[PDB]
Amino acid sequence: GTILIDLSPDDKEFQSVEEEMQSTVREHRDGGHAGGIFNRYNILKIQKVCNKKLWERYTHRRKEVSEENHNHANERMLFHGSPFVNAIIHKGFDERHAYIGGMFGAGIYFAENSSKSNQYVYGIGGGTGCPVHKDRSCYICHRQLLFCRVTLGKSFLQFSA
Amino acid sequence: KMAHSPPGHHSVTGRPSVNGLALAEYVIYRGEQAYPEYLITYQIMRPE
Numbered sequence A: 001g002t003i004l005i006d007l008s009p010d011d012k013e014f015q016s017v018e019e020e021m022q023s024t025v026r027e028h029r030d031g032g033h034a035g036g037i038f039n040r041y042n043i044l045k046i047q048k049v050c051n052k053k054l055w056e057r058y059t060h061r062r063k064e065v066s067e068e069n070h071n072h073a074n075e076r077m078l079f080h081g082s083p084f085v086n087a088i089i090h091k092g093f094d095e096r097h098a099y100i101g102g103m104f105g106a107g108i109y110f111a112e113n114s115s116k117s118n119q120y121v122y123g124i125g126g127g128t129g130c131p132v133h134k135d136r137s138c139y140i141c142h143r144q145l146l147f148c149r150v151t152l153g154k155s156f157l158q159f160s161a
Numbered sequence B: 001k002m003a004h005s006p007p008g009h010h011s012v013t014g015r016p017s018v019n020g021l022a023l024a025e026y027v028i029y030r031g032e033q034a035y036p037e038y039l040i041t042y043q044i045m046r047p048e
C-alpha cells in the first residue's frame, strides 16, 4: 500500500528536508568509525512516503497518546537509519526494528542529528559498512535515511554520559 | 519480546550531557508512534 513520490529540488519541501539533514551533521566521538568521515551530504533524492493504512495506524495511536498526555502529542520530526528501511516503509515500525542493546532499553531509536542516524544505516556500529566495498566510510554507495513523524507524548528525561 | 516505557511515560529522551554539541536521541516502545514520512537517498562527502 506504500507509494513513494519524488520531490523536486526546486520544491521548498525538498529544500527544508535537505537543510535539516545538512545542518544537523556533527562530529562523532568515534572519529568516524561507525558512519564515516564527512561534514556534509550529497542529497540524491527525497521521496514522500504515502501509506493510508500505516498513516491511520499512526494517527490512532497519536490520539491515544495525546489524550493520555492531556491533549499534547509532543510530536517531532526525527531521523532514523536502519538496514530494515525497505521493510519499514512498507510494513511500518515494529519490534523487529528495535534496539535490544540500546542505552535506554529495548525500543526504537530516533535522532535529532542526521549523522547519528547515519551511524546505523549499515547496522549497529556501522556493521561492516556498505555491501559492495565493506567500507563504513564509503563515498560511492548510495545510503538511505528516514525522516519520521514521531509521537513522544510524556517523555522521560534521561541525561546520558 | 520488547520493552516498556517508564510508567506514565510514552517515550524516553536521551540527552547527552558531556558533548555540548550533541543533540538528543529518542526512544519509543510502540512502533505505532512513528511514521516514515520521507525517504532520503544520499552519499556522504569526503572532506576537501
Ligand SMILES: CC(C)[C@H]1Cc2nc(O)c(C#N)cc2CO1
Pocket (backbone or CB within 6 Å): A079, A080, A081, A082, A083, A084, A097, A098, A099, A100, A102, A109, A110, A111, A116, A117, A118, A120, A123, A124, B025, B026
Ligand atoms: C537496526 C536497529 C537495531 C538500530 C537502528 C537505529 N537507527 C537510528 O537512527 C538510531 C539513532 N539515533 C538508533 C538505532 C538503533 O537501532
Ligand SMILES: [Zn+2]
Pocket (backbone or CB within 6 Å): A130, A131, A132, A133, A134, A135, A138, A139, A140, A141
Ligand atoms: Zn561502497
